[PDB]
RNA sequence: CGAUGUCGGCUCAUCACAUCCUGGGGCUGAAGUAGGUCCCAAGGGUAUGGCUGUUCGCCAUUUAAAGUGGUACGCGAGCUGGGUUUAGAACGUCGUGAGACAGUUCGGUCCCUAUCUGCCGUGGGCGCUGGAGAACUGAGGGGGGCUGCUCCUAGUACGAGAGGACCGGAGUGGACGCAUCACUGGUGUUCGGGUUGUCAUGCCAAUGGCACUGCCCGGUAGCUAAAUGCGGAAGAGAUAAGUGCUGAAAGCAUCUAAGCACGAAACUUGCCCCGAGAUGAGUUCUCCCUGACCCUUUAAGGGUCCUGAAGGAACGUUGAAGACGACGACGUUGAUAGGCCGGGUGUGUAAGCGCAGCGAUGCGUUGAGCUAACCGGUACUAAUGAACCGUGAGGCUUAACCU
RNA sequence: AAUUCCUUGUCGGGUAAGUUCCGACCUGCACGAAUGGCGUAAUGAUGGCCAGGCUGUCUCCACCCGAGACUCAGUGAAAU
RNA sequence: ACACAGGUGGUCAGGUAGAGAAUACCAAGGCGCUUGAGAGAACUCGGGUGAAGGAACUAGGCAAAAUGGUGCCGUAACUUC
RNA sequence: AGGACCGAACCGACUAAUGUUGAAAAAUUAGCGGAUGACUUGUGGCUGGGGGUGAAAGGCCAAUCAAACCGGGAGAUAGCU
């Protein structure tokens, strides 16, 4: 949600916790929805993954403890911030497997192909 | 307000049932995806605010693929369209935020008043 | 914080003007009994406009 | 267009069947009096002197009585006027007056906001106060430099210092309505409105519509 | 700032607040007559009416209640026996207020708050 | 030199254009896309980090863009005190030494109650020509003036292909601003509950005091952003650079000498706010006062008696109004505040009794007691009747109408 | 290097990014052996760097509790 | 200098909780600190609590936040053992 | 046993904030170091100014120190204000 924020990362090849360190678009955008993409460096990152330790790339974020806020008035909001590995050429994730609930409001692009993997929206 | 509330009073839906924080709550609400629309199923324990009148909170925690969701709903909205009582428990507070933080510790059962 | 030059006593008393006091224009006698009184006030006779409320 | 006078009641939620949940404010407003008609041979301009209320006859004096008691009497809370351009009015008061906001769809609404009284410099403008731990004596949400040393000399007039905040005219424009209701006596618009519950508003239609 | 907020400071803390309350609303339960500056005796009205409410209906569990608020078994013993019974047939409005002259230390708006009905 | 505080940073700015973006144009070795260069234009906008005391600079990642310069290299009676520049101590170098160096390293007191101007906000007096209550006109003055991405037009024009538009529409964002509390939340030492140590209320029970509100758990009204609505345009007039029409001096040509016609976020308007002290003191509507004398220079008044109007004020009950004034509601023809009643809300099954259990404790009564600033009513209490201020028809000259 | 002017020397480590840190090389402007050289467990309100926990330091401030400021009555200074 | 938030040697030493002369409430005893009364602005002083992030602040984690007891389990490079 | 460890009285004075015409001519608050010793303290005595004393800073010698205070040479001298 915002530059230094470690967040968890929700699919396969992306691994372990990342810090976003540039919220994109806008001149001085200070914070970072659902559907927005960041700027990440990898913080921590498993052995087998094609990720590795200290390399630049993007994510959307897919989970926020703020939540996202329907139009009804409600809100569904998580434990836990989490982000979507996203290769930084094309915006497709890297990852091939998407763990953990993943919400509604990015039905745009290439999050729909994101949606397709993820087990609950 | 005498007139406030006046047009609250046909916004209310009368069949919202009796519930109280504890309880493991069912509710369905429709999710729309193109022209065609659906009922998605939301189960688990409440921690919910009494009613302010047609604004009204019921907010629920369930975890489900190992991440905590909490999600309120407005009991007076027509998205929401079904809400079940399954479990009926009891705790002494009003709100459950310090028992939300734990995991895999489960709320009691009790027969009356519950 | 200081002054560099002396205020003159024109501008003393013009700085002076706006602080004079006021008289009250108006003393009620009270029914009961013929004492002037401030208004909403014990006339310290023990009474207020109907009778003797306090006894001292 | 002539824009009738109301009274704020409060905020309230809408549902629709959608289930959007606009927010709505509710604007009392009562059947408007015309009380006096300008036009250009009496001064040259036109307007509707219009009055909205009940008073209690014991606080109305004699000036404001006897111009209630010519052209059509009404006894009200006060008199506000509404330029008029393309019509013309009677000077008898309307019947119902939510009427003509009920075909329109964007309002322009005018009303004293609260006060908020003296407010300092980062309440009233959007000012950022000085850190608060590494040193900083005496200075934290303390006004700055309001000046460029000698060569201006002086303060400049639009420097802003602390002052009051609230209790002016504000307009918010391009509002919403949601629906009328003259049985209900009512107009409900979209969103947030100015003033304290209880005030006097002044709805419009919109200009920039 | 504040709007629609109630209750007086009248420069105290609260804790000095609620043992100042709780003797002025002694002091005039018991001589049914106390001189007091204005302020604090529109809050002493504003405690020592519900006080008085409480003691219209007798239980023991008023009568803790007013023990637990007001604190000394005497005032609850008048209280309960002979203030109340008196303002049974009254709808609220147990205390009346007369302003007085300024007390000659300090200029302070002072004045007698008294119970509506008077055992003397 | 009987003292004008030194780099940089934080807070706050203002100006110039020699313009970084956005706006308009000329040429192009400008096919398009993208450039290059030059003219016009100052309305708005013009990053966040790593390193270093740094200005600067390099680097990462953004952006439409991360402009250049003045203002005591803007701002220390606004802040910091890292750098520099006191006294200690040390290294390298110099000197026999005391000591020294734009070298280097660790540590090193930053005062002020604002008189005047200047701004930011609020009153008191007087004026405006009889005196009051309101509602306005607008000479002026301020605020605002930013813009990304996607989709259609359109894979059209152009282009061998690769690629890829002009014009015009439609959505959805980023920073900025105004308002507000219906939602999401924060605070909510004035509401409820749990609990530790101790002290008291004669002791059990139940409570109160104190330990930061003793520590916490929630939370009403209000204030509030992180929440939510809206907003910087549409369109006119006159233009800058430019592009022109007609047309001579100069039979041709020529945007100009005459006449005419376009042209930008710049100018004047259009939007929002203040605003008649606008002494040039404006307009409209309503309300109220039309009695006796006396003396005196009679460029005119002064005094006495009678009468005090419309209305204002003072006092009180007060407010989502407020430092104090002020502004707004009410004063018994009364809902202005406190209490009362009813609801709501917030805690979460009060107390008392009975049952079960050895006991801690549980169960029933019972969603129970308590409930704030909330909402709807209700004269129970305080808003006393007087009293105060303001008067008695409102100058002269001239012009039109009536008489 | 508490000693390097050139100098933010060059290479490696740490970071997305490192004029400081750490390990190296040696071109030591201008280390060096009781004016002591190099190392060193323990110790230090010692200097420089890094990580975890934690947070209003910060993004970006919001509310609340008290003492002044504000008003009233009393006393009543100061530099200039 | 002052009816001044400073300095001043020795003695005694009750309870509950506690290792204790710490600390919390208290006995015996002594005080409420020689201006008060209102209202509840900006701003300053001392505190309390904060959604999301967690040092992005800064010269520097300065200040705050954190941590803390008793018993048991367990405990590394290095070393002058 | 220990110039051993943790920690009150006691001695000290590293940090920040407040005060800076102060409550105080060097302090208050929140942390901080030593705390059986090269400790800390009471009463008295000794060292006297080119002198003393100094776990050494130009430190201290009565709110004064790269030469105390008080009186005298003394109306030092002043090409300076």
């Known amino acids: 949600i915002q530059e230094q924020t470690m967040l968890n990362v929700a699919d396969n090849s992306g691994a372990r916790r990342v810090m976003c360190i540039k919220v994109l678009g806008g001149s001085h955008r200070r914070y970072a929805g659902v559907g927005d993409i960041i700027k990440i460096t990898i913080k921590e990152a498993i052995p087998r993954g094609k990720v590795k330790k200290g390399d630049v790339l993007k994510a959307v974020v897919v989970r926020t403890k703020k939540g996202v806020r329907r139009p009804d008035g409600s809100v569904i909001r998580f434990d836990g911030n989490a982000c979507v590995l996203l290769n930084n050429n094309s915006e497709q994730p890297i990852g091939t497997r998407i763990f953990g609930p993943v919400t509604r409001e990015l039905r745009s692009e290439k999050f729909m192909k994101i949606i397709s993997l993820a087990p609950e929206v | ?114 | 914080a200081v002054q560099q030059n002396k205020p003159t006593r024109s501008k003393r008393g013009m700085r002076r003007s706006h602080d004079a006091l006021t008289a009250v224009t108006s003393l009620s006698v009270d029914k009961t009994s013929g004492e002037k009184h401030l208004r909403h006030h014990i006339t310290a006779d023990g009474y207020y406009r109907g009778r003797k409320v306090i006894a001292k | 267009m002539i824009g009738l006078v109301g009274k704020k009641v409060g905020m309230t939620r809408i549902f629709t069947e959608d289930g959007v949940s606009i927010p709505v404010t509710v604007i009392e407003v009562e059947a408007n009096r015309v009380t006096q008609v300008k036009d250009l041979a009496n001064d040259g301009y036109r307007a509707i002197q219009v009055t909205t209320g009940a008073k209690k006859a014991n606080r109305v004096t004699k000036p404001e009585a006897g111009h209630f008691a010519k052209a059509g009497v009404e006894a009200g809370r006060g008199l506000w006027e509404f330029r008029l351009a393309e019509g013309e009015e009677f000077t008898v008061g309307q019947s119902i007056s939510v009427e003509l906001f009920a075909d329109v769809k964007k309002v322009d609404v005018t009303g004293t906001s609260k006060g908020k009284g003296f407010a300092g410099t980062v309440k009233r403008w959007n000012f950022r106060t000085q850190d608060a731990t590494h040193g900083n004596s005496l200075s934290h949400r303390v006004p700055g430099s309001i000046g460029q040393n000698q060569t201006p000399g002086k303060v400049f007039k639009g420097k802003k210092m602390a002052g009051q905040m609230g209790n002016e005219r504000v307009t918010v424009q391009s509002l919403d309505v949601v629906r009328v209701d003259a049985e209900r006596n009512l107009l409900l618009v979209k969103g947030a409105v100015p003033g304290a519950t209880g005030s006097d508003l002044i709805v419009k239609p919109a200009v920039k519509a | 700032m504040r709007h629609r907020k109630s209750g007086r400071q009248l420069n105290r803390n609260s804790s000095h607040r609620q043992a100042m309350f709780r003797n002025m609303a002694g002091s005039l339960v018991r001589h049914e007559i106390i001189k007091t500056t204005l302020p604090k005796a529109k809050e002493l009205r504003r405690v020592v009416e519900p006080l008085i409410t409480l003691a219209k209906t007798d239980s023991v569990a008023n009568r803790r209640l007013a023990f637990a608020r007001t604190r000394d078994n005497e005032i609850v013993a008048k209280l309960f026996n002979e203030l109340g019974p008196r303002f049974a047939s009254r709808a609220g409005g147990y205390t009346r207020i007369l302003k007085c002259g300024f007390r000659a230390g300090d200029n302070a708006p002072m004045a007698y708050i008294e119970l509506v009905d008077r055992s003397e």
């Open chain 2, 1 to 114: 307000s005498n007139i406030i509330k006046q047009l609250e009073q046909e916004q209310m839906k009368q069949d919202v049932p009796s519930f109280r924080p504890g309880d493991t709550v069912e509710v369905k609400v429709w999710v729309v995806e193109g022209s065609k629309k659906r009922l998605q199923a939301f189960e688990g324990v409440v921690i919910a605010i009494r009613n302010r009148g047609l604004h009204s909170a019921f907010t629920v925690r369930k975890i489900s693929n190992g991440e905590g969701v909490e999600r309120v709903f407005q009991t007076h909205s027509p998205v929401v369209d079904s809400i079940s009582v399954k479990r009926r428990g009891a705790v002494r507070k009003a709100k459950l935020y310090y028992l939300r933080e734990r995991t895999g510790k489960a709320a009691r059962i009790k027969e009356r008043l519950n």
